[PDB]
Amino acid sequence: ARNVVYPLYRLGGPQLRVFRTNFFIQLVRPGVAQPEDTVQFRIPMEMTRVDLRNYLEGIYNVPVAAVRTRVQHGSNKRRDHRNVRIKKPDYKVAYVQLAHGQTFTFPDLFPEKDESPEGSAADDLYSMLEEERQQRQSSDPRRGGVPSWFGL
């Protein structure tokens, strides 16, 4: 849990148990080539290695072997319209490696667009757009500038 006060552990005291955790992680495709078991996440700043270990071994049952983290510095160079700096927020990314030789490759979520729904609210307007564009593009160079409307 984050933004909660932790009960102080007197020596020989009970096990610190968190029940409804407050951590939300984002699996991210890497930006450089990574080996076949490296799985890069994106975690809040108040998370550690062993918290990510127990998080992935309790909820998703994913066998993790080693976990390494680093703190990413967000940029603080963008000037606003009144020359005050806009801070892009820092975050922490974590690279875990699977235990039993299992592999993972980042899927493709966008391919491949195949859809042609019945269109009233948008595609009827697009149909009128393309029909106007196909009808009225009958301009001619031999007329020289006279309007192509009059039957005369």
Partner: protein, 206 residues
């Protein structure tokens, strides 16, 4: 999703989170505020969907259906009635498809219409003694109903199909709560069979 607007922000016929609105009035801008009649939220009468009557403009007297209400400047747009013309698909080599686009009308210039005689009519918010509160015509003495309009969720309830990640109706309403003086923590800790035998020692708070 939740952006705070500048304190003098003009409303501009578009959603405030659109891209054409950010093109019109960005954070860069400051201009004269349009002084508007303040109207309480109990005497506001017309809603989005009721038949109305334009009192003045290029076509006075015509009826129609309001399709959008803008409370922050007291605006309505009657559907395809008080229009002017603009081209949509616009390029440097071709632009046509001239479309009728509406113009906003103030609440002074728009009066309600009662269904029995189809005439412009003034309205009062006469409270009904049966508990509810509906509008009552002043001159004709007839109740004007609040018209049904498809809500902003975009979902019609009768044609709704439950997906895999939507729980059903008979499970969300089933009373499972047995209220007791235990906390959720020790309740689920005795539920899952977890046992702790050592105590929590004293801790000095200051």
């Amino acid at each position: 999703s939740k952006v705070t607007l500048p304190p003098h922000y003009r409303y501009g016929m578009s959603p405030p989170g659109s891209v054409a609105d950010k093109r019109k009035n960005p954070p860069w801008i400051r201009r004269r505020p349009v002084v508007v009649e303040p109207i309480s939220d109990e005497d506001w009468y017309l809603f989005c969907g009721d038949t109305v009557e334009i009192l003045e403009g290029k076509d006075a007297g015509k009826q129609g259906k309001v399709v959008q209400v803008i409370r922050q400047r007291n605006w309505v747009v009657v559907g395809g009635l008080n229009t002017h013309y603009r081209y949509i698909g616009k390029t440097m080599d071709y632009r046509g498809t001239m479309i009728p686009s509406e113009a906003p009308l103030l609440h002074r210039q728009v009066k309600l219409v009662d269904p029995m005689d189809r005439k412009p009519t003034e309205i009062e918010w006469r409270f009904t003694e049966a508990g509810e509160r509906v509008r009552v015509s002043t001159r004709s003495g007839r109740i004007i109903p609040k018209p049904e309009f498809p809500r902003a969720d975009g979902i019609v309830p009768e044609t709704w199909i439950d997906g895999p990640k939507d729980t059903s109706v008979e499970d969300a309403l089933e009373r499972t709560y047995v209220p007791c003086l235990k906390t959720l923590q020790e309740e689920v800790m005795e539920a899952m069979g977890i046992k702790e035998t050592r105590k929590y020692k004293k801790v000095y708070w200051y």
